[PDB]
């Protein structure tokens, strides 16, 4: 999915901001928050990239 | 990179050059690379070659698929669910 592609390309940023995340669940959770903050046009770009 | 290979013996799991692969084999069997041979079935693999030449289809979730020195040179099926 476009969300998974974004998360794969931004996991390093998530880990750099939150070094205490040991579990992939919280990484997916924070990624969902950031991916919601993205604009409609950016989310369309990721949906087309996927 | 990130080629993982099964080496039949039952098999070793290994992960770079054929020389490094022989070093992995030495990492358990302890014989040096000069006392080892490696093959792609019948086709011999030379030391200096990368494992990509033996090609990133051997991805680590499904790695792809050995002889020793006798005196001076090297020589000499799974089940199903019921």
């Amino acid at each position: 999915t476009g969300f998974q592609m974004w998360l794969e390309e931004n996991r390093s940023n998530i880990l750099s901001d939150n070094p205490d995340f040991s579990d992939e669940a919280d990484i997916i959770k924070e990624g969902m928050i950031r991916f919601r903050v993205l604009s409609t046009e950016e989310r369309k770009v990721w949906a087309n990239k996927a | 990179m990130d080629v993982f290979l099964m080496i039949r013996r039952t098999t070793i799991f290994t992960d770079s050059t054929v020389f490094e692969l022989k070093r992995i084999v030495e990492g358990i069997l302890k014989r040096p690379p000069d006392e080892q041979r490696l093959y792609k079935d019948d086709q011999l693999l030379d030391d200096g070659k990368t494992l990509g030449e033996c090609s990133q289809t051997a991805r680590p979730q499904a790695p792809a698929t050995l002889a020793f020195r006798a005196d001076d040179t090297f020589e000499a099926p799974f089940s199903s669910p019921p």
Partner: protein
């Protein structure tokens, strides 16, 4: 440094110790009093070999930026895999 995992069929799969130690029951079998190798009367050769294949990516990429690519599984095998994974904690 290395670990040898023997299936019930006799087929023996030889892995790095981190790869064997990913799983709970196998890292328990690699931990006994008074003292590497583990043998499994439960697991057949195909399931144990494919479990080693799963280990080979689980060590390569965990908390990785890259995805986990699809493991080799089938629903017919999945019953044996259920019992094996329940035993092994892989």
């Amino acid at each position: 440094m290395y670990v040898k995992l023997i299936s019930s069929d006799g087929h023996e799969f030889i892995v790095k110790r981190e790869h064997a130690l990913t799983s709970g029951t196998i890292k328990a079998m690699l931990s006994g009093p008074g003292q590497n190798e583990v043998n499994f009367r439960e697991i057949p050769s195909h399931v144990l070999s494919k479990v080693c294949m799963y280990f080979t990516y689980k060590v390569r990429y965990t908390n990785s930026s890259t995805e986990i690519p699809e493991f080799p599984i089938a629903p017919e095998i999945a019953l044996e895999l259920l019992m094996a994974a329940n035993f092994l904690d892989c």
